[PDB]
Design a protein around this ligand. Structure first.
Ligand SMILES: [Ca+2]
Ligand SMILES: [Ca+2]
Lengths: 17, 144
């Protein structure tokens, strides 16, 4: 089970390719 | 997630109108600086000029001012989260992020990338060419 990051998190913005 | 409270907005309004010479509701660059110094900060010439042009003569009204203050809140929260993330990515705590550390943390965050893709991200963010990503290179990588 992977960690759940908030939508406004910079790391999730890094996921964007 | 984090937003400006009614208390803060009211305080921003009072600080805005306290240094508005006319009753127009639009302050200049010089007047904006005095507002900032009343809010416990101290920006410079270029900083004040960059803030006033980011939200559009060289004058701004309160709705544009509140927009600028909201963006400051958004940026200061992103700055610490990047600082938080760096300590997580830096598994051994040596002050650098290796390709192995990057791949491991990405796995726990539902991000399965190939070893080549990881090498690319490191190669892309590595300015001084040490082989690993330090905090300075990490910030630029996260800000984009
Ligand atoms: Ca490390
Ligand atoms: Ca480096």
């Amino acid at each position: 089970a992977p960690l759940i990051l908030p939508p406004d998190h910079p790391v999730r913005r890094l996921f964007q390719r | 997630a984090d937003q400006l409270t009614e208390e803060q907005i009211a305080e921003f309004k009072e600080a805005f109108s306290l240094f508005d010479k006319d009753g127009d509701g639009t302050i200049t660059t010089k007047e904006l600086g005095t507002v900032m110094r009343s809010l416990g900060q101290n920006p410079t010439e270029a900083e004040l000029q960059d803030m006033i042009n980011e939200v559009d003569n060289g004058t701004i009204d309160f709705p544009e001012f509140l927009t600028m203050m909201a963006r400051k809140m958004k940026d200061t929260d992103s700055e610490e989260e990047i600082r938080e993330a760096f300590r997580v990515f830096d598994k051994d705590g040596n002050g650098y992020i290796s390709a192995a550390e990057l791949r491991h943390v990405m796995t726990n965050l539902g991000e399965k990338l190939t070893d080549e893709e990881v090498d690319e991200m490191i190669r892309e963010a590595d300015i001084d060419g040490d082989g690993q990503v330090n905090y300075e290179e990490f910030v630029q990588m996260m800000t984009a």
